[PDB]
Design a protein around this ligand. Structure first.
Ligand SMILES: [Mg+2]
Ligand SMILES: [Pt+2]
Length: 208
């Protein structure tokens, strides 16, 4: 509904990106709402129906994709067949499919979002959210958490994501969003934000 009213669309996998990506946009001084850009969670990893809607045979709306490497090869061939149809992409290896897809604003993260943020400078703020959302954690789990903060290179990823999923991925990301800053922005998110910003700004510039 908002898609039909938007100048651009940022496609993301789930609720964590749905709230974290606009928070990074604001500290990058890229004002998504003022620019008419909507963030849309596809609720999974199937981006193809949305690329069909926004591609040249659909509404022809500038859009970007943020997705996790984890089979990302097939996921990206599925959208490249739409946005670059009908060219064969079957003979490309994964890294070739990935570097082609960046041309269309589709960007892959080599990690998953929350562990990257924990290791990449948001360790202590994520601890405070977890302890506020889960205030009766057993002492063993508190000790492991303090230990990850003291050495974000040593983290139990399964347990971290277990705690975040227990809080709720969307709820957790909203509570974390006020802490994000420009210098801890993951590269794939900065790339996607700049790509969609550039496309919308180029539209305005072409009025002369
Ligand atoms: Mg992601
Ligand atoms: Pt609890």
């Amino acid at each position: 509904g908002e898609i039909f009213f938007s100048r651009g669309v940022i496609l993301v996998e789930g609720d964590a990106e749905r709230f974290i990506v606009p928070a990074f946009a604001e500290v990058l001084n890229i004002p998504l709402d003022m620019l008419g850009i909507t963030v849309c969670s596809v609720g999974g990893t199937n981006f193809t129906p949305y690329v069909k809607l926004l591609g040249p045979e659909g509404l022809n709306i500038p859009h970007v994709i943020l997705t996790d490497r984890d089979l990302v090869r097939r996921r990206l061939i599925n959208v490249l067949d739409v946005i670059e149809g009908g060219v064969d992409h079957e003979e490309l290896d994964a890294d070739e499919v990935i570097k082609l897809a960046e041309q269309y604003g589709y960007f892959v993260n080599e990690n998953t979002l929350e562990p990257e943020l924990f290791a990449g400078g948001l360790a202590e703020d994520m601890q405070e959210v977890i302890r506020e959302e889960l205030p009766r954690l057993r002492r063993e789990t508190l000790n492991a958490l303090q230990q990850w903060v003291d050495d974000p290179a040593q983290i139990d990823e399964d347990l971290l994501l277990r705690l975040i999923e227990r809080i709720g991925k969307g709820r957790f990301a909203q509570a974390l969003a006020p802490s994000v800053s420009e210098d801890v922005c993951p590269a794939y998110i900065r790339s996607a934000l700049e790509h969609i910003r550039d496309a919308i700004a180029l539209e305005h510039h072409h009025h002369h």
